[PDB]
Write a protein that binds this DNA or RNA. Structure first.
Ligand SMILES: [Mg+2]
Ligand SMILES: [Mg+2]
Ligand SMILES: [Mg+2]
Ligand SMILES: [Mg+2]
Ligand SMILES: [Mg+2]
Ligand SMILES: [Mg+2]
Ligand SMILES: [Mg+2]
Ligand SMILES: [Mg+2]
Ligand SMILES: [Mg+2]
Ligand SMILES: [Mg+2]
Ligand SMILES: [Mg+2]
Ligand SMILES: [Mg+2]
Ligand SMILES: [Mg+2]
Ligand SMILES: [Mg+2]
Ligand SMILES: [Mg+2]
Ligand SMILES: [Mg+2]
Ligand SMILES: [Mg+2]
Ligand SMILES: [Mg+2]
Ligand SMILES: [Mg+2]
Ligand SMILES: [Mg+2]
Ligand SMILES: [Mg+2]
Ligand SMILES: [Mg+2]
Ligand SMILES: [Mg+2]
Ligand SMILES: [Mg+2]
Ligand SMILES: [Mg+2]
Ligand SMILES: [Mg+2]
Ligand SMILES: [Mg+2]
Ligand SMILES: [Mg+2]
Ligand SMILES: [Mg+2]
Ligand SMILES: [Mg+2]
Ligand SMILES: [Mg+2]
Ligand SMILES: [Mg+2]
Ligand SMILES: [Mg+2]
Ligand SMILES: [Mg+2]
Ligand SMILES: [Mg+2]
Ligand SMILES: [Mg+2]
Ligand SMILES: [Mg+2]
Ligand SMILES: [Mg+2]
Ligand SMILES: [Mg+2]
Ligand SMILES: [Mg+2]
Ligand SMILES: [Mg+2]
Ligand SMILES: [Mg+2]
Ligand SMILES: [Mg+2]
Ligand SMILES: [Mg+2]
Ligand SMILES: [Mg+2]
Ligand SMILES: [Mg+2]
Ligand SMILES: [Mg+2]
Ligand SMILES: [Mg+2]
Ligand SMILES: [Mg+2]
Ligand SMILES: [Mg+2]
Ligand SMILES: [Mg+2]
Ligand SMILES: [Mg+2]
Ligand SMILES: [Mg+2]
Ligand SMILES: [Mg+2]
Ligand SMILES: [Mg+2]
Ligand SMILES: [Mg+2]
Ligand SMILES: [Mg+2]
Ligand SMILES: [Mg+2]
Ligand SMILES: [Mg+2]
Ligand SMILES: [Mg+2]
Ligand SMILES: [Mg+2]
Ligand SMILES: [Mg+2]
Ligand SMILES: [Mg+2]
Ligand SMILES: [Mg+2]
Ligand SMILES: [Mg+2]
Ligand SMILES: [Mg+2]
Ligand SMILES: [Mg+2]
Ligand SMILES: [Mg+2]
Ligand SMILES: [Mg+2]
Ligand SMILES: [Mg+2]
Ligand SMILES: [Mg+2]
Ligand SMILES: [Mg+2]
Ligand SMILES: [Mg+2]
Ligand SMILES: [Mg+2]
Ligand SMILES: [Mg+2]
Ligand SMILES: [Mg+2]
Ligand SMILES: [Mg+2]
Ligand SMILES: [Mg+2]
Ligand SMILES: [Mg+2]
Ligand SMILES: [Mg+2]
Ligand SMILES: [Mg+2]
Ligand SMILES: [Mg+2]
Ligand SMILES: [Mg+2]
Ligand SMILES: [Mg+2]
Ligand SMILES: [Mg+2]
Ligand SMILES: [Mg+2]
Ligand SMILES: [Mg+2]
Ligand SMILES: [Mg+2]
Ligand SMILES: [Mg+2]
Ligand SMILES: [Mg+2]
Ligand SMILES: [Mg+2]
Ligand SMILES: [Mg+2]
Ligand SMILES: [Mg+2]
Ligand SMILES: [Mg+2]
Ligand SMILES: [Mg+2]
Lengths: 155, 260, 188, 124
RNA sequence: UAUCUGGUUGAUCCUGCCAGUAGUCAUAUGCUUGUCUCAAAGAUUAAGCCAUGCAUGUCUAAGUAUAAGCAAUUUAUACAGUGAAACUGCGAAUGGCUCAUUAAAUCAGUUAUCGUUUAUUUGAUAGUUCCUUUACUACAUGGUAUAACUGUGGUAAUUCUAGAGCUAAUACAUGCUUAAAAUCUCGACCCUUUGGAAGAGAUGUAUUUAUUAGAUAAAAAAUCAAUGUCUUCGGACUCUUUGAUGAUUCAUAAUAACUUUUCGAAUCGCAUGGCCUUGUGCUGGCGAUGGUUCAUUCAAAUUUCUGCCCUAUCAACUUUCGAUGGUAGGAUAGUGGCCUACCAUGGUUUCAACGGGUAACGGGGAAUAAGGGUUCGAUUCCGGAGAGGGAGCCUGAGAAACGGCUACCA
RNA sequence: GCGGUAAUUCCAGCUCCAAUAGCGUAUAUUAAAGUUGUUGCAGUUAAAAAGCUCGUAGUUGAACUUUGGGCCCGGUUGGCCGGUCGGAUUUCCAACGGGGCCUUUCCUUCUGGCUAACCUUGAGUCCUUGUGGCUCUUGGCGAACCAGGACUUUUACUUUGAAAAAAUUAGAGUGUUCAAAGCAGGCGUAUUGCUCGAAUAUAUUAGCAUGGAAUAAUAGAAUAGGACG
RNA sequence: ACCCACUCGGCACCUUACGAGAAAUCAAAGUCUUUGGGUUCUGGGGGGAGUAUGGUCGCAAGGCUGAAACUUAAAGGAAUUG
RNA sequence: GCCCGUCGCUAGUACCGAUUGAAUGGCUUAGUGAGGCCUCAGGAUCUGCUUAGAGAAGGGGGCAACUCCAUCUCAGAGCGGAGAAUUUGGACAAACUUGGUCAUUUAGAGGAACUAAAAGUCGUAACAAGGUUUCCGUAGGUGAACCUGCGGAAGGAUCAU
RNA sequence: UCUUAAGGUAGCCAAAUGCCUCGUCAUCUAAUUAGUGACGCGCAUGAAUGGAUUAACGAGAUUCCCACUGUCCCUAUCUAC
């Protein structure tokens, strides 16, 4: 999420061990580090062009994505830099030989390289414990907005 | 539960030892060693349950405490020592040389080999890392670490080892079409060449296999141990050559060789 | 004592959780070093599996490097000036990581003026060679130089003294130094 | 903490307690072959029922099915081996037929009498 | 291995339940009881209470023997056989028992550590340790202080121990050492060039910080600052070195430093040999114990996805006193509201949150045989939890241990 | 339901029945029970449609989008011969399945690596009058999958497979004298060893991995802010 | 306005009964052991009892929600003959 | 014939209920707070490193001058270490006192149900147009069943002008 | 069965209304002519002579509890007048 200010904390926000020598005059001010998570997830340009910090970013942060890769649909985007997604699924009950709609809400960290909105479908990678509840990180936005501008005014 | 488990309940013991259900409450807990608990064979089970050279375990300690057994070259005086796959058991007296190598039913079979073939072994490299002071090292499934190996050696290749000294004298890369011996799963004990490897980034590469009867089967990369070229192995395989026969096939084989 | 489990503390639903099993030694935690300035005094903690941790309580010197200058000098730690977590650490001059301290300068002056032959603020043979090869390279920086006149340099602790026993930092430079300059005075 | 020395029982007991027909037939069977229990009949009819069951389960598979072939044959060669199943009718649909007497006739009880040697199932 | 029968009426067909019937690794009880094999067994109620005994100790040629022990004999006048006591080392964190707590907990199947600790086993792994650097530093080996023991004592009483006198180490505490080379900073001089130099110091491993290398997505150019090797003196630079993963700031290496400085053998047993400049010189066989880091093995700790009985006469729940997230730190072996400081207002819920019940440890499994099911699992294997109830902690690789201590309660 | 004076139910004797080293009783539970009903109940009058209509959660939800034809390839049963010294394979033949093709027909896609396959042919021929047959390099197959770059609408269902403790269950072998079991054992030169074993099945829900593209959902281009270059 | 023919949607009756039911009866109460269009609600022997208790609504009378201990072998339906 | 209610007898079960009743268990406020651990101190005693004195030792190599290493011994001076009782402050936090909460139980004079129940006493409510058709909802009334008003239903004693 | 104008209904009670009376049963206490809850043939309760029920309010009468205290055990000392 984030937006604005960058340097908006009591601590200086920096990427660890990424020195920019002041003697060396540079036309980009700050030297930035990035990587790619793997599994073919393109590290979007908003992460390389960006100026934010997010050490919990999977592309510009200090977290590795490994283990599960899941998808859900975004139902809450109110926590700063993290969301909650719903994962529906039908559970099979033998005795009756039918299914019943179940769901679970996974909390997942979201880098400010993604502009996420409630409703979008998101693809999420498992990673080490980020918070009390967050065990996942948004690694791909498979949606957009759901024809938001196609609800505009009259002729 | 507060610390390491020193006992082993006979029943929790691995089934490929073929220990009898009753006649006791425990089994030998394999000592820590070169081979994983569940894929080892303790010297007491070999010197006594496979080889019948003892009756008590008390006699297995009597045999062993006289340096009769020597494993892969060194003497070894551990009753429950975790002998394992590719290891060379060697009795100076009796002039016998055994190599541990799987059945086709998936067990460790008593395999007698020459006095000369019993002075080298195969070891699937499990990792190859650039060690301390820039010295690269290669470490093989049986817990051998060997400095300064060939550059072309990478993980999953297999390796011929001196036994006398430690040095690597040959190595077979993991390429489609190379004699393969399955080390785990229900296809454990089979042998057959390789078809091709399914990739799957993030976990568990599948290894398509075909044996010398045009029978196919898949296993995980973890369970594949390269041992040579089609036809030409590199060590003496056991009878049946890891082909696996159906229940019917085996019934006719055993009930055709019957004329007293 | 302290326990870092999650078995206390409510589930995300807000449910209240039972007291399953007693406190385990591996979930242990210990009290803070709350390390201080002056006169070396260090106690060694015996941690999991042998293994020592060095809890520093009182420290007068640390090993501070001047990154854009390539060298690392041991100096006196004069005091704490800024700390983003808690201001009682600045008021008690309590040394932790990320604490902004003021070191000594004089070993960095002694090195610079003997390496550049230029002096801050305000005759040998090969020495003159080196002092000529260096330049277009001695410009320092307005903010690091005016600090030197005061005989004290802003630096940022980067080690964990209650963990390692060391109080090791790096001199504030360029962007960081600007930020904490603003913070320092925009509260002074 | 020892391996369970496993066991099972060898008879079943008729659902209907008092069926004159079944009591008549059972009795004749005890006096024909010299048995002392209705249990000696129950036990054999229990064997018959587990056989008939496996026989039905095998028969529902496809012909030439690997299990049907392997296990069906073993059961047939087994029943021939002792003398319950004739050589002529040697293909498991007669084992689905069969009856208790065919089993009873093969006891050492009944054989020692059968080729003389006793001349009374009880003397046997 | 797909079955029914008795009872409502004067008689009838129904609905319907009661009763009969069969089995139970299902308990109890009653009567009766000869033989073979197999053999469960204070779970249920009271995780109530406990007399007495026992259930954890341990020695190899190979850490310590002046037993004022035994044996003597067979060479042993330092020691040498055997060996109580005691030191030292390891073990007691396994085993066995119970099922009280526990309901998203445990457990299970499936993941994760690019998120950590690991005695041991197995395989590797160490020329660098001193010092203004000729009148040198024990290396042919540096220090004491203790047990047992002797002797004096205390208490009704314990595996209580005090004062005095000895003496060991692989206990405690110290502390020397080894080749060649290269690379870095200093630089006495000399001399003007484009510039070069004797000789001085630094460089084991580990620890803390900061910095650099760790390429590769197909190909080429100019310039600034420093500055490498080769001149056929305008100049060129040609061969140019690259590990792993899906993925890293990874493995590994380089610079400047740091450290009440980690390891770098003051140990033991068997044999006793070569080699001359004849010093008991200089060398030297087999293997024991140790020792740092790496791997391996035994582990551990967290950990992804999904699955729990009844209940709405529980509908809202969560932030007192962390509830959900951000930042920084502290703490941990390590991730994490685990904890603290600041900041935000979040988290869950009829797809049943939250709460209550459970005569609830979870699983492998058991009983019942048309099938679909129903019921059960304290209990021989696996996982968890406990040791009268709580908390706290010492030792240690490993315990929040109870056949350990400490405090409270009973 | 029996017993109030000829008691077929009581108390006994006699005889008789059933199960038998065992048999009765109590409590529970399973079957019978289609009296919990998914399979599979019932609700006019026997128990049971809310006085009525709206209505959210939930469950459910009309039809239609590559269908049809043509060609090739190779399997596994079954027939009629058997050629053979009980099994054998070719042709004659149907039957039932699998793969790839051409019909306007993405197979993700570039850039090479690799080729197994014929539009090839370079020679001709073993041999039945010849398209019956494969060795055999010089113009001419992509996909069989390597690896690098660049991107991709989401699911449900099913298939196969990997990963899969032991004991338990199902079940093969073996004469514990039988049996419950156990995993043994079986052969000789039984004076100096020979040898078969210690199977197989289930193992589902979830996760992984592959094949299918019917049936069900989902997304797309209408203020064109559409698609290809 | 009336008559005849037709067709939608009504309120009904008549006769049938292939079919259903325990029957009375039923064009649904049918297409149901040859057992599956979709969906809502309720019942599980009789009493105890719509009682006790809590929650809720109402001024009140009362409404909705709504047990258990215990007791009991019948209660009940439709039809037949008396 | 059947049958309804009050009233009466014996036995059982549960309910309401003054006692602001009792009991077990799980949480828990406030107050008090043991203990180990961490930390500021403490310093019974017991050494170190350094510095100087006096009395003897051994020679780095000389004829007098000149000189290193280790070791033991008593006035006297600096700068640190071990370390008991004690002790400051903390986190952890049993436990006590007092309350509250939740769950599971439970005494009670008395009230009032129901059952065993078929018999009894008083009536005749229902079953026949049950002798006032029966029943529903509501409202009042009466020893008791029940009666009466208003609106329904036929399950009516009418499928019919 | 006598008798009346009618013969006390709903309610309520040893009630500030009950003689007997310190009613009987329960509860509170070590013990209660007190208090409360019950019962009721009630000397002689009872319906705007108003009956019954009531939240709130009371320098109203009564009972008990906590806290509190020289009320008491059991007294003593001090200041001012
Ligand atoms: Mg962030
Ligand atoms: Mg927020
Ligand atoms: Mg987050
Ligand atoms: Mg062992
Ligand atoms: Mg041994
Ligand atoms: Mg710290
Ligand atoms: Mg009946
Ligand atoms: Mg009757
Ligand atoms: Mg009737
Ligand atoms: Mg009758
Ligand atoms: Mg009659
Ligand atoms: Mg009956
Ligand atoms: Mg019954
Ligand atoms: Mg027997
Ligand atoms: Mg007892
Ligand atoms: Mg018990
Ligand atoms: Mg038990
Ligand atoms: Mg009791
Ligand atoms: Mg001696
Ligand atoms: Mg010891
Ligand atoms: Mg244990
Ligand atoms: Mg000492
Ligand atoms: Mg590389
Ligand atoms: Mg010698
Ligand atoms: Mg070692
Ligand atoms: Mg945080
Ligand atoms: Mg942490
Ligand atoms: Mg809030
Ligand atoms: Mg909210
Ligand atoms: Mg619910
Ligand atoms: Mg329990
Ligand atoms: Mg259970
Ligand atoms: Mg269990
Ligand atoms: Mg229990
Ligand atoms: Mg686990
Ligand atoms: Mg106890
Ligand atoms: Mg304990
Ligand atoms: Mg124990
Ligand atoms: Mg307590
Ligand atoms: Mg009689
Ligand atoms: Mg009878
Ligand atoms: Mg009789
Ligand atoms: Mg029976
Ligand atoms: Mg049935
Ligand atoms: Mg029922
Ligand atoms: Mg079905
Ligand atoms: Mg059916
Ligand atoms: Mg029914
Ligand atoms: Mg009805
Ligand atoms: Mg209706
Ligand atoms: Mg409604
Ligand atoms: Mg449709
Ligand atoms: Mg087609
Ligand atoms: Mg086809
Ligand atoms: Mg499958
Ligand atoms: Mg009909
Ligand atoms: Mg009819
Ligand atoms: Mg009922
Ligand atoms: Mg109420
Ligand atoms: Mg009103
Ligand atoms: Mg009410
Ligand atoms: Mg109701
Ligand atoms: Mg009510
Ligand atoms: Mg009574
Ligand atoms: Mg009280
Ligand atoms: Mg009580
Ligand atoms: Mg305290
Ligand atoms: Mg502290
Ligand atoms: Mg009660
Ligand atoms: Mg009561
Ligand atoms: Mg009473
Ligand atoms: Mg009642
Ligand atoms: Mg009645
Ligand atoms: Mg009447
Ligand atoms: Mg009458
Ligand atoms: Mg009339
Ligand atoms: Mg009437
Ligand atoms: Mg009725
Ligand atoms: Mg009146
Ligand atoms: Mg009145
Ligand atoms: Mg009255
Ligand atoms: Mg009165
Ligand atoms: Mg009074
Ligand atoms: Mg009064
Ligand atoms: Mg009382
Ligand atoms: Mg009083
Ligand atoms: Mg009184
Ligand atoms: Mg009163
Ligand atoms: Mg009177
Ligand atoms: Mg009046
Ligand atoms: Mg009055
Ligand atoms: Mg009122
Ligand atoms: Mg008042
Ligand atoms: Mg009063
Ligand atoms: Mg006075």
């Amino acid at each position: 999420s984030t937006e604005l200010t960058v340097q908006s904390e009591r601590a200086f926000q920096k990427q660890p061990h990424i020195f920019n020598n002041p003697k060396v005059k540079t036309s980009k001010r700050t030297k930035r580090w990035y990587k790619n998570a793997g599994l073919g997830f393109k590290t979007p340009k908003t992460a390389i062009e960006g100026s934010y910090i997010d050490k919990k970013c999977p592309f510009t942060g200090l977290v590795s994505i490994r283990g599960k890769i899941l998808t859900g649909t975004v139902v809450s985007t109110k926590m700063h830099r993290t969301i909650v997604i719903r994962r529906a699924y039908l559970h099979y009950i033998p005795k009756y030989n039918r299914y019943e709609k179940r769901h679970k809400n996974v909390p997942v960290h979201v880098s400010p390289a993604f502009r996420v909105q409630v409703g979008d479908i998101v693809t999420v990678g498992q990673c080490r414990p980020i918070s009390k509840t967050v065990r996942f990180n948004v690694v791909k936005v498979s949606a957009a907005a759901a024809x938001x501008x196609x609800x505009x005014x009259x002729x | 539960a507060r610390g390491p488990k020193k006992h082993l309940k006979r029943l929790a013991a691995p089934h490929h030892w073929l220990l009898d259900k009753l006649s006791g409450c425990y089994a030998p807990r394999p000592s820590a060693g070169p081979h994983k608990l569940r894929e080892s064979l303790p010297l007491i089970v070999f010197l006594r349950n496979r080889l019948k050279y003892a009756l008590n375990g008390r006699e297995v300690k009597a045999i062993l405490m006289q340096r009769h057994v020597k494993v892969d070259g060194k003497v070894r005086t551990d009753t429950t020592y975790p002998a394992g796959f590719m290891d060379v058991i060697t009795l100076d007296a009796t002039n016998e040389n055994f190599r541990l190598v799987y059945d086709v039913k998936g067990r460790f079979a008593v395999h007698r080999i020459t006095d000369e073939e019993a002075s080298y072994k195969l070891g699937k490299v499990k990792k190859v890392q650039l060690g301390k002071k820039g010295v690269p090292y290669v470490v093989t499934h049986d817990g051998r670490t060997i400095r300064y190996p060939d550059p072309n050696i990478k993980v999953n290749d297999t390796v011929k080892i001196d036994l006398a000294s430690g040095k690597i004298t040959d190595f077979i890369k993991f390429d489609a079409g190379k004699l393969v011996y399955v080390t785990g799963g229900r296809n454990l004990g089979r042998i057959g060449t390789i078809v091709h490897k399914e990739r799957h980034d993030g976990g568990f590469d599948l290894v398509h296999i075909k044996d010398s009867l045009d029978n196919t089967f898949v296993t995980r990369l973890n369970n594949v141990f390269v041992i040579g070229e089609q036809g030409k192995p590199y060590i003496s395989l056991p009878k049946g050559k890891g082909i696996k026969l159906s229940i019917a096939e085996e019934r006719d084989r055993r009930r055709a060789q019957q004329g007293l | 004592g302290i326990s870092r489990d999650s078995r206390h503390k409510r589930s995300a639903t807000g449910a209240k959780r039972a007291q399953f099993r007693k406190k385990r030694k591996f979930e242990l935690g210990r009290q803070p070093a709350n390390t201080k300035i002056g006169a070396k005094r260090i106690h060694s903690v015996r941690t999991r599996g042998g293994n020592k941790k060095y809890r520093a309580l009182r420290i007068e010197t640390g090993n501070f490097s001047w990154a854009s200058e390539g060298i690392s000098k041991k100096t006196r730690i004069a005091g704490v000036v800024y700390h983003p977590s808690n201001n009682e650490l600045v008021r008690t001059n309590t040394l932790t990581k990320a604490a902004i301290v003021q070191i000594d300068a004089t070993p960095f002056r002694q090195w610079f003026e003997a390496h550049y032959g230029q002096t801050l603020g305000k005759k040998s043979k090969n020495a003159e060679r080196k002092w000529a090869a260096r330049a277009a390279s001695a410009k320092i920086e307005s903010s690091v130089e005016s600090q030197f006149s005061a005989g004290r340099l802003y630096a940022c602790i980067s080690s964990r003294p209650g963990q390692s026993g060391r109080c090791d930092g790096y001199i504030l430079e360029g962007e960081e130094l600007a930020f904490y300059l603003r913070r320092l005075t925009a509260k002074k | 903490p020892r391996a369970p020395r496993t066991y099972s029982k060898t008879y079943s007991t008729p659902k209907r307690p008092y069926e004159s027909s079944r009591l008549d037939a059972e009795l004749k069977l005890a006096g024909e072959f010299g048995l002392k229990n209705k249990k000696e009949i129950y036990r054999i009819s229990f064997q018959l029922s587990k056989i008939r069951r496996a026989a039905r389960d095998l028969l529902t598979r496809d012909e030439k099915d690997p299990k049907r072939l392997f296990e069906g044959n073993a059961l047939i060669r087994r029943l021939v081996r002792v003398g319950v199943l004739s050589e002529d009718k040697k293909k498991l649909d007669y084992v689905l037929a069969l009856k208790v007497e065919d089993f009873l006739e093969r006891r050492l009880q009944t054989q020692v009498y059968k080729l003389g040697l006793a001349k009374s199932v009880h003397h046997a």
